[PDB]
Amino acid sequence: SYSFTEKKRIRKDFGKQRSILEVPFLLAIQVDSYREFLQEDRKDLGLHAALKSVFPISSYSGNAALEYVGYKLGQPVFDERECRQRGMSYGAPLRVTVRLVIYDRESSTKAIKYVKEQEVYLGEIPLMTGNGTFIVNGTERVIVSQLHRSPGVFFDHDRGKTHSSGKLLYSARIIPYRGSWLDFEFDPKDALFTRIDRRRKLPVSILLRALGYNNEEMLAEFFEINTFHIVQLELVPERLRGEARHVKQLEAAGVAALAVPDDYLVGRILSHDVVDGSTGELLANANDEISEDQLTAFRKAGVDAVGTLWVNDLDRGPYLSNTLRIDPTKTQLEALVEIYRMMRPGEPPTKEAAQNLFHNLFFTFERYDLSTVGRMKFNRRVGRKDVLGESVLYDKKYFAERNDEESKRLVAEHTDTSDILEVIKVLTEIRNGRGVVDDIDHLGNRRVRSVGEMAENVFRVGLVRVERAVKERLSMALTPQELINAKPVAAAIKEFFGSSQLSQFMDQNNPLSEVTHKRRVSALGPGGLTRERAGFEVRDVHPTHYGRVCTIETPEGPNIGLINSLAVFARTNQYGFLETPYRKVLDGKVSDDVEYLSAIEENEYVIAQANALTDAKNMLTEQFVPCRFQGESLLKPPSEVHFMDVSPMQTVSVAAALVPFLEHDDANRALMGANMQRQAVPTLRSQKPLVGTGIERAVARDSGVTVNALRGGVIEQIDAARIVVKVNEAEIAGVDIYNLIKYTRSNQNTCINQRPLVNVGDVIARGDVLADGPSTDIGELALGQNMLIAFMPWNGYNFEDSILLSERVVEEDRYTTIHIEELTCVARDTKLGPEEISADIPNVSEQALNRLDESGVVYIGAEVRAGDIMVGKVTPKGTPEEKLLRAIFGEKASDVKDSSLRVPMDGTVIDVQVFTRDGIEKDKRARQIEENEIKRVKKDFDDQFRILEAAIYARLRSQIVGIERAQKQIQAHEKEFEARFADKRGKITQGDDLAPGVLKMVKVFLAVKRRIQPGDKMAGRHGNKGVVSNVVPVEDMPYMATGESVDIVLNPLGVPSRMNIGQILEVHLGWAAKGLGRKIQRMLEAQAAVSELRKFLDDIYNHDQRVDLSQFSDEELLNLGKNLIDGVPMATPVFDGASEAEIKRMLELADLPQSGQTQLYDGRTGEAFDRKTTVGYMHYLKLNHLVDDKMHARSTGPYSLVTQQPLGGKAQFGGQRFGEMEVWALEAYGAAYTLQEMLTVKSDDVQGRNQMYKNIVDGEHEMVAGMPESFNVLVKEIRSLAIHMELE
Amino acid sequence: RGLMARPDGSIIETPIKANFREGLNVQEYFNSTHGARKGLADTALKTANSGYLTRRLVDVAQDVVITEIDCGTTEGLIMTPIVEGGDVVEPLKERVLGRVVAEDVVTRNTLLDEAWVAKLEDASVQSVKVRSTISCESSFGVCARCYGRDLARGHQVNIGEAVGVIAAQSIGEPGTQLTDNITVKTTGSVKFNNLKAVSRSGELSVLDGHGRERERYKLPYGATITAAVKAGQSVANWDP
Amino acid sequence: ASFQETTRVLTEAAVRGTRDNLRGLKENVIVGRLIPAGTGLAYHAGRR
Amino acid sequence: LRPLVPLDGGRFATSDLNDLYRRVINRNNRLRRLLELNAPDIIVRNEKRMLQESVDALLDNGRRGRAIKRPLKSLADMIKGKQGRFRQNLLGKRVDYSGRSVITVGPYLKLHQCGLPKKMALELFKPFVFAKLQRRGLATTIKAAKKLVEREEAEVWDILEEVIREHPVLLNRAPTLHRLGIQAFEPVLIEGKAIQLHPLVCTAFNADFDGDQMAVHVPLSLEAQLEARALMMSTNNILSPANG
Amino acid sequence: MKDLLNLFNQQRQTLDFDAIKIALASPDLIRSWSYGEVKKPETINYRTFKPERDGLFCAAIFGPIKDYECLCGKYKRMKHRGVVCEKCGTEVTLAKVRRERMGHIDLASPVAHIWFLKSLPSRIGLMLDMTLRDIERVLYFEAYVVTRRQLLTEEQYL
RNA sequence: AGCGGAGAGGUA
DNA sequence: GGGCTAATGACGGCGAATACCC
DNA sequence: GGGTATTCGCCGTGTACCTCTCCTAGCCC
Ligand SMILES: [Mg+2]
Ligand SMILES: [Zn+2]
Ligand SMILES: [Zn+2]
């Protein structure tokens, strides 16, 4: 029932209710999107969709068509560690099979000659490493998700942005996937205006005339037209309501068409025109104001109905009539050339060119390409029943006159959809029928793009470039391999994966930071918003974010709200929207079924919150439950609810759930603590958190820094570098072997290590851990240590968020971290001569040359210091005594320059990597390390072959108890081992890839183990950051009544100011846990029985979730008691459990006080304090902001050549920028001579700084100031603008 | 903790009836982090606008330098205590202290100290003419007597001090920290100012026992006044 | 032309042909002379 | 004034003014070649239009033509703006004899004095240490004096302690919105890597003690030292510039 | 590249003035500013580290690359000053004059300054009493100008 | 061998 | 593989050209 | 000729510091 990892250690867990749904895979969305994009294992959507969309190519001269039947992804030529160490990219070749056919001209179409060029090389696709990372030039990059605007149609408005009036204007925008944007804007004079791609605005009458619509047809379709009589008119009972008893009397009477005088006809607009064949002229135009002469002509003609338009003040609006009155164009060709002149300014008009441009602007698949999610959003916003539709924008009048083959198929399925008139009519009913608008703040209005969609987009861009090349290349038609060019698609995929706003450098200092960086979503990007723009409307949280987007995990700085984090149970839907699970709630009892609802479907049903009490197993005993309907709180009876939350961890993310007592802390301090945990550094010995949550095991499992056993078995062969398991007959021919990484640098210059934890000869199951990773316990996540805390002011050393440390926290090496630096020595090729790595360097003493070998580089495992020469490199810089010295020696006497690699940070050298190019003779040390590598691979290949032969012989001995396949399997394993050894020997004997111009590269790994220093930044767990003031000996620290000295003395003044009190409960729970651990150690120190330990564990585990103690063993119970000798870890859920009574009971179980406050004595004078302070163990960690990285100074360094000023940054000896506000402060002081010697003498003047330096070193005082050189630069830059500036 | 506020302006119908000592629900924590994000965005834009206003005010007032010790300007400025219909904004003892006087209330061209402010408070003075920098007759500078005393030192301002950059920086200090019926509150005698009720501008100022003005209300046209007036009453009841 | 609309003040000074008398605080920082406020007032008194 | 920056492998970084100058020179040479050829009016009209557009892109790019994924800088953008030659090199300049470090709290210090690290003060007061080593006679040349400084014996600590005794330094907060963001202190040598500060100073600085860094500056002239002693000392700046 | 004898002398510039005058520049004054005329848009030749003659980076117009050195190498002494070499014509002087000297371009056709036209207080529009759109159409070669001040379409000009 | 333009992350 | 080779997710304040009937 | 009424542009929107990557690469042999 319990695995070996759970049997090793059991933590106490108390809460309100149990968890129904377990924690899913934390990195699932990226690997599922990349698996859907690759299609490595069909292949309907993904890369195959873009390959099927682009590759049909029709040439201009005909008889040239390109077809394909599929694509194959080749195996990578290098390993993951091979691309990590050598510097290559972990990519795979993409090969397609292009089929080229040639038709016969001036005859019927037939396949005259068809070829099939297999293995067409194009691009290299970087594969994932199983956790969401890929190696790009030796570095791991993480592409985060993008939260952009979903395609479709939206209706927005502006509040007081124009006309300075209370009336608001509406806007309709059609956002496609890869097409040109369409807009529909109103006008304060009641008119409609449209524009394409933010161009000059035009009325919609030009677009409707270019579509092919007449004014009479659009007036009959938009406005409801009534009839007239020859004057009289028809009576409408609904039209008389606008002008209740008179309308009811007219409805109950049932009147006919009554007579009406001519005073009602002058205020109307004619809908359709009237003509007379006897006269020969038009008696009335369409859509005009009626006059007396037009009425006289209509009476003389003898017309029956002239037509009218239903015009109201609020229910109806004559916007199309005013739009036709504004635009004077009445010709379709004039409208088309007006659209062509608005699109391309400064071009002569052409009929068929503008016709092809208007056809390719909106009504084609190669340019517009509206996606299916945009079609679904379009049909959901308009109100159509059908969901899936055409991928191109359809019109009823435009596609009716087309003669293409696809147009007849499109007109038969859509059957006059007319989406443009549908959008205009929906906007008209928004303006007139009093409809509601939607703002872009919901998670259903937004969409999530993963790495696969952006990779398919940049691959489609590269394929469009390749198609544009091949359309010219296939004009005169040879093999298809000479047509397809891999260079533009390779450059596009390299520019996407190398340098992009979505592909950034990751951090690998902590597993929690790795998990929250792979799960991070970001609204920035090429289609996203900018941080510099005013984005206050999107930085605030929306009620749709509950359950899908974490709210309290938000970085500090400019991007507060633009860079969000995904929730725990949140996942991506099939269309890209975010979804969260719920529970199916029947009337009464609640069924435990999981249904993932989208963001646009959660507002329709009443969803109850997770904070709902239940007396039975599944019921609702509350008359008013705290449910929500539209994101706000509501009190509803339980007979109307439909859904409920599955877990209280649904709101927070994986970085916000690991901090205990989140319900007792403020939101700002929780926001600080969720970001402070991502900067922790792994120490030498990591300790488990005494006050945890339970989600640390899922984060340590899904982080990937630890290894796990796929098949359980015997671990009888174990080493510090490799772990060999032996599977059983049920899981299995060869056994599995796991290689552990020992010492390699991460992306943040930290050390990662995998130390094993299993023993010799113990059975395991599938899923147990075998080696604890960096900053990782036996299955829990470990960030910091456990140490005594006292909240009291101590002589001003903990004054304002300052931290006091004892000598016992330093002398036991608790915060000692290992940092691995990368120092390289590059030997370029110059025109005067190539630089060598020789050890004989002039003007260098023997004290810096003893550590150098005969190769010129340093040994492995040599203690170096700051300024030591590690790699000796010389370069040639080019009287009869010099000729005599050159003739006495072998042309290596003089004319050399010393430029070697020095240490900037003292430590030992752990690895020396030497890279050489082909054609260069290898060094004896390079030959020696080559012999070492081939001996190592021969040794471990022989050991693996011996283990496989021993397993095969054991299976053969087990098979002959009661005969040929084991020998064939052993022969196949021997052939595979020989092929792998030949591949490794051929890989490590050839020259690596280098830049053009470098002959040799030497990389030296330097490992520095830094201790803790006064001034280092160290934060807690709840967001209480601090800086170490000084190191105090143990004799001055305050001690308790038993003699235990407190390590850290914190300040209690921050508690009422920052308003967080979860740290006090964490201190009390850590004090209770340390008391329980001391009681267990005191029980196991003497000769005690097993029953006393059993009843003590039964008392401290459950009190009446339920942990049985009579299940495992007696020896397993002794192992559990030995594992609990450092402390009993407690599990506190993020929004339930851990009340005051439970903490008081765990305090009262041991010999500990109830209030958690004991009286401690001062160590300096031996007297007693007046009050009792809170003493306990708090999980305190160390940040990455060191004191060595930030402390730097300079006197005189290098200067720039554009302007005579010092450089900037800690590197290259940069000076501090004396800003403008500091100059304002010095001018506020007065300070003429201080400000003159600050920006002229010290910084700008060339001769002035030399004169001041020599006057300092000589003793005399004669300061001569001068003009800054940047003023002369500004004068020379102004004079280049043909503007004379003279210094009179 | 009471009710929580939403950024659109509406208050939530249900409050948070739980402190940080007890547990908080998820619907209360949602409003808590909503208010926290609103406050963080508010102080970010406040810091940016304060920096821009500080830069603009520094670049506007940078030519004013104390050049001469005396100018000879007898224009003056009348100082009154600022009452905005409620509690006092700036009293007389803060607004008067630090500058010289123009007309005899006291001797002209004399720097005022705390003893002179205490003597004027014992004498119960209401308005004193002051010498300000808005009425100066200097050539490209401010007189040393019109500015008054320094703010860093309690003595007179020295000749050559740039009083523009200090003033602009002091105005730009707290920018990161920014955001019918006449019934009297305090007791004291009521003294009408500019009255004739047929009055265009009416001021219902009161005088306390020490001689300072605590309350000052506005009176519209046709305000009926009922009235050594005690507190808790209404001098002007209503005027619709 | 120090903080806003450098092109407009530059073309206005180019058309009008103005002459900067350096009687300020920021232009003495740009040119590189002493500040005419505080300890630098005696240098400006002795210069003119 | 417009130099080329080289990269690894012989490549050069791209420039903004050089491409505009090459475009102007190339279009002017094309106009001269079309004028010597006696071209018709349409071709020389289009060439003069291209010359006017290239001159417009050279003088003020981004106004009408916006010549280029990112628009390159011109002569007009190099003067105006925040990143121009007027705000980054004239009002605010990079200075030497300066450094920064984190700050802690020191309760044993006085109001007029502050702490300073040993290696930081050795790097800042290096010319005075060199002058005192030349005056004491421990080194004949400055090369032996520099090697004796990097050797780090006790005599260079004696020289550094004798130099820093009556020499004030200017401590500055990285935002300087306050008038009292720059104050002068007499530094002492501490055995650490941070800058200890008096607790009565950080109120006027508005500075906390969690990741706060403060840049220091040393005045080296006699007038600057006396100005820092007189009108920049922390004991002289008691009252606030806003109120009394 | 490296020079140590010229580096020791100081107090060469007094930098003492009273006022700063800014005005326009005549083409004769711009011609008197420069020292040479550029003709080719070539900065650095390929496969060699040498500047191009009559280019943007040239030694005959602005100054030599190395200090007290020519492009060919006929004069390699500090005693030679004010002498122009015969093969590649450059002065044997300090290498700091490359930061001070400038060149000029002879345009085949005159162009208009965009700082006097594109600004909203337009100076050429106020001096010629014309609107901004007319001068924008004339300067971009879309119409004609009579010489009294009216616009002309090319068909109307015909 | 020194002189640099973008993009990303983090601290006050 | 190789060496020359010429987008449309901001927002507010403000001075200047069109439209037009009296 | 002359007053409102929109309307197209012009011009701006905090400082200081610390890490990392990637830079014009394309083509017909
Ligand atoms: Mg701080
Ligand atoms: Zn005055
Ligand atoms: Zn020469």
Numbering used by the authors:
A (entry chain C): 3 to 43, 49 to 237, 243 to 255, 277 to 510, 515 to 769, 775 to 920, 925 to 950, 953 to 1010, ...
B (entry chain D): 745 to 849, 860 to 933, 950 to 966, 977 to 1007, 1012 to 1024
C (entry chain D): 1324 to 1371
D (entry chain D): 249 to 316, 321 to 496
E (entry chain D): 1 to 147, 156 to 166
What is the paper's account of this structure, in its own sentences?
P7 is the key phage protein to regulate gene expression programs of both host bacteria and phage Xp10.
P7 inserts into the RNA exit channel and makes extensive interactions with RNAP with calculated interface of 1182 Å2. In the structure, NusA locates at outside of RNA exit channel, where it interacts with the tip helix of βflap domain (βFTH) with a hydrophobic groove of its NTD domain. P7 resides between NusA and the RNA exit channel of RNAP; the β2/β3 loop of P7 inserts into a cavity of NusA S1 domain and creates a moderate interface of 221 Å2. Structure superimposition between the Xoo P7-NusA-TEC and E. coli NusA-PEC reveals that the hairpin-interacting regions of NusA has been occupied by P7, explaining that NusA losses its activity of enhancing pause or intrinsic termination in the presence of P725.
